[model samples]
Target chain A: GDDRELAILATAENLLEDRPLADISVDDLAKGAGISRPTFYFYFPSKEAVLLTLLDRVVNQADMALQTLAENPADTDRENMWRTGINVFFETFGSHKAVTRAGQAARATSVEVAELWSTFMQKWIAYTAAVIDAERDRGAAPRTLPAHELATALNLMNERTLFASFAGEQPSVPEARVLDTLVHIWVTSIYGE
Target chain B: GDDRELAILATAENLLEDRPLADISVDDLAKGAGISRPTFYFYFPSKEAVLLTLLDRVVNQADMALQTLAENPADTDRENMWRTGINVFFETFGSHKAVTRAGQAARATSVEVAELWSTFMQKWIAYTAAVIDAERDRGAAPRTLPAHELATALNLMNERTLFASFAGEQPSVPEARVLDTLVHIWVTSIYGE
Candidate 1:
């Protein structure tokens, strides 16, 4: 079961490398993996399901990065921790650009995909907002807005910026600059330094 | 000709209010506007074209806000100008949430919609970058990253934040706070103040 799932996921990612999720038919996915269409449906509900399974792995790793950031909000080396979190996010996401891009595209119209994507983001936002609240409680972060709203804006920045850049859906910008810029926004907005 | 186009555009917007652009068939669009599917095709090749045409009118209004921002980059009241620019953007886009959400969802997989969205965004990025470049020329802004990259990141922040908020596709966050949080990011990222 695991082997077939892996094969199907890999085939879908390879197909997405050059084509959009919308363009890749179920038959194409099944054929690419040397499985019948019915077999493909047996394992995954749809192509978006395959993408969500892939994205879930990437986001789980990302959650760990945030977990580290959350645990060490008061550490003197928090800036470095922030950088690490940003790096893990872009790096993990960058490696799976094709699948991630497909998920993003699918999330636009697919209700289930959109909810899955938002749920993942909300978890991250809660993680971030908790830390921001801790800082606010200690009079460290700005209270001009609620912690959740601030967290939401920052997360969307990362999501949108990475989607455009890693997907190569727009003109290329240097990854270092993009990473640094995001870090700058996160740090300045939260730490207000 | 103009009346038919307007009717089709309005019909698409009305339809999008309840369902996703992907779910709405061209026949639905035609029937809504009291035309045949072929007539719908005669006026608009695809549903996306109808969205683009509607979007173009909105972007045209938004262009003036950027025009004001670009012309007075060195205004003593720069923060106020930035706030005004941001307000015009969210307000205009907010009014047409259905079409915008449709276009955004479509861009995930449609090359045509992706390009149309990118072209519209690039124009704003260029406008924003020019202002950043001007501020740097006058020794008023940071020069850590190239102006275009900075502009791209900030513009993406606004675009992503607004899309998430207006689409109601995510957990609800207040509109005013969202706008304020975005303005904070823009002012800080650009002026570093």
Candidate 2:
């Protein structure tokens, strides 16, 4: 039981590496999973269902990465805050570019998928907002834009830059320089020179 | 002759404020423009061609606004650079939210549209990179992230914030605060304290 379910999921993941979810049909999925069409349905009601499952797994991994980064004990350096924060994302989103790209497209068409992703984004944004708020209280970072608002803009910048790269668009900057460039923006913007 | 062309463009623009490009048909465009279907075809081969015309007009106006701001900006003030740069986009983009929203969606489906947009984006990014380069050269803004790379990220941030707001989504920040938030980011990151 466990094996067949996983096989279906694994096959979908493998297929998506080369083509979009729409291009792969039920027959292809079922055959690759070493099962019949009905058997594929036994695990996933539809091909889209398989994608949602894959999307959930991909998003959950990213969510965990972000959550871990958010609840950290201490990084005394402001530079390290974003340097570390943005790195985790490149790893999570970068490693699964095709899946992330597909899910991003699917967000517009599926309310359930859209909410799932939004809920994660809001969580990440809230955590960053708290970090900025605390920095202001610490007196090291003077208040500039409202803490929450600045956090929202910066995090969206993070997402857009990475997604553009992941989705096969030219990145906002060089792939090698992404971390340093983004880190520079955060450190300079929040902590000032 | 000119009246018919303007009439078709005006009608398309009006309809887009309420619906996406795909959602509106040639009949709708024809009826609204007081033209028959064949007449609509004479003016534009397809509804999408009408959208491309509108998109070009929208982008061209914004390009003019940006070009005007970039050339001979002797403000001697860094805050005003982004304050003015970002404000132009809000007016250009925010005022034509529906058409911009449609163009953004259409970008993925059409190579001609995508390249048109990318070329505009590259032009905008290049202008910003030049500004940042000049600032660094003037000893006001320090050399940090490569000027070209930093400009790319900052400008992309500028576009993403405006588009999210224009596309009927909650802005990264409150609408009132976007200019200040952007201005502050550019000012602090480039010029430092």
Candidate 3:
């Protein structure tokens, strides 16, 4: 178990670089790590768990991207702040497309992945809602839906839109346009501009 | 092969009612349909193919929901038409949550499902874009993004938002509110009101 855990993790990451989570089997992970299937299961319960661990690492980097929102808090520059925060998300997503793509796809069928994603999104919603609430307090934003719900909808928009774009399947809308469209919706919804 | 095909479809639909599409293996599908594993593959290539056929059926019914758009075309009542069209979609989605849920989830991983969903979405976007273009020509709607792209974003918003709502993990926003919120975005985005 000493280096076996690290081997499993490293092997999974390497394997995922070329293929999807579903395409890479446990035997593949086990063999790639130079361990037996039992040893692989001994180290991690399932392939998803390994991906979850990898996702855990990438999420920290992604979370740092969200911290950009805190860097510039002036109401006058809120639109720019919004753009910066969204860029960070897209940047991280682009860099980790393999793992992130698998993670995003797994949210549909895997309970654990779905729960982990939900928790992550909730953190984002709370952060965004707080910012919207502050803007409303300054009389710069509208009080359409509660800040939380609006934040939730907008975050969901980013999540699905970016997921589609990263998957490289939504060809009609280019990456820049996707970003601009999302930012426009966010600014219009919150700032009413 | 005639009744066999129908039996397979029926069995797969029944199985999806209880569990996710991913959980229902080909062996389980064949067994449910009272056929051998080879027989299952004989009729369909994979579990995904069976799903595509099932999805095809549901989408046809879902398409009927959009017909509500043509039922009303008064420029002054465009807001009501938008709401009615969306309601038809949500109503159909609510009734056929099983197939639609699996379809939405399958989109992330299954290329066929992803492509099928994309094609279906383009049809909706085209339909919605036509309406938006007509409104713009009549001097009733804003000309922000191209009608098609605006239609694309709005459709994506509805797709992701409804998928999250159906997943039932997003408790912060209720069903009715999600619908209202989506309608508001649509109305505002087009009307600039």
Candidate 4:
């Protein structure tokens, strides 16, 4: 993860983990990277800029995974989609827990970051809607809910689980358990069969 | 609303609306009440005591509303329940926006307050669970989810919606639309009928 972009993300993330995103100072982040404050400013104008940059990396990678799953069609069965979707989401979450947690925690704190977070989620929903539209066209999934509803529900569910898992003490439920519950809830809530 | 409880609520709310909760000291609250700090402490143990006291007022009143709804079956239809429940909930939030906002804002500042907030929600969930249980026993409601699941979803939906409404530039949602959307989502997700 030591490429130029990743090094910046690594430094930013390491700082964001220990402190609330609202409190992180530019000098502190720069010092943590063993760089001058001005140099840090060259890369990021504000703390949120560093975060949005890091999140760009994470989101791009996740979007690629989601695209792969949607296009593969190797597992066209309903249950398999549930299992695969759940696994992929939780894995994406686990792989970048710090970045994701920072985004969620920041949503209520920084206005810009909150907007960024919401926009990011809306993008996920839109992408998911397109994928569902294709699945419905192929008669693989029910067309009962408009794709937006399905996308909105899954996006909200993913977020709720992610926030709840980190927001409490004695965080016992493994990420996998959250994925299982989400998949079950989604399937049961849809189709009613 | 004419009792000492309402008097304290009115005074504390004025203070909250004027200053950030972080800036409002106990002395400020007492002075706002034309009373000594000890007298305020006698009525409320801590700053958070003042908050929970207001919360208690709302919760107690809402509890009565719930009982009334239970007794008045005609008004307790699911849609009406959704309407009245949200109106009751947000009316309290609207009146004590300072206290409610402070309580949520405190979650980022104090672990104790966050746990207290969770306890408040957990109690609501338990209360909802009891109602769901009774409905199931009377064969008036489907037993699709364990009482906890239904309760959790309902409680969380209320929480998320209110949070969204409040977090906006202004709480612009008409209560009826809020109720309608809530009941629609609930009926769709819960009964599948």
**TM-score ranking from best candidate downward:** 2, 1, 3, 4
Model 1 over residues A70-92: C-alpha lDDT tens digits?
Answer: 66644566566567776767887
For all candidates listed, what's the TM-score of chain B alone? 0.86, 0.94, 0.84, 0.72
Error of 2 at A121 (Å): 1.0
CAPRI verdict (incorrect, acceptable, medium, high) for model 4:
incorrect
lDDT over C-alpha atoms for residue B114 of model 1: 70
Per-residue lDDT of model 4, residues A6-121, tens digit only: 56668888876677677878777877777778777777788788887777777777778877886775776665676686576667767777787777655556777666666666
The C-alpha lDDT values of all candidates are 0.77, 0.80, 0.80, 0.63
CAPRI class assigned to model 3: acceptable
Pull out the clashing pairs in model 4: none
lDDT of 4 by residue, B26-136 (tens): 887777677777777677777767776665565567667666755665654755655675566666666556666666666666676666667667766777678668767
For candidate 2, the TM-score of chain A alone versus the native chain A is 0.92
Question: What's the lDDT for residue A138 in model 2?
Answer: 85
TM-score of the first chain of model 3 = 0.85
Query: How much DockQ does model 3 earn?
Result: 0.40
Instruction: Kindly indicate the candidate among 3 and 4 with the higher lDDT.
Output: 3
How many backbone overlaps does candidate 1 show? 0
Best by lDDT: 2
Clashing pairs in 2: none
lDDT of 2 by residue, A93-177 (tens): 7888877887876765677777777787787888888888898898988877778888888887887777775665753576677
Candidate 4 chain A: minimum summed lDDT over ten consecutive residues — where? A167-176
Error of 3 at A169 (Å): 1.0
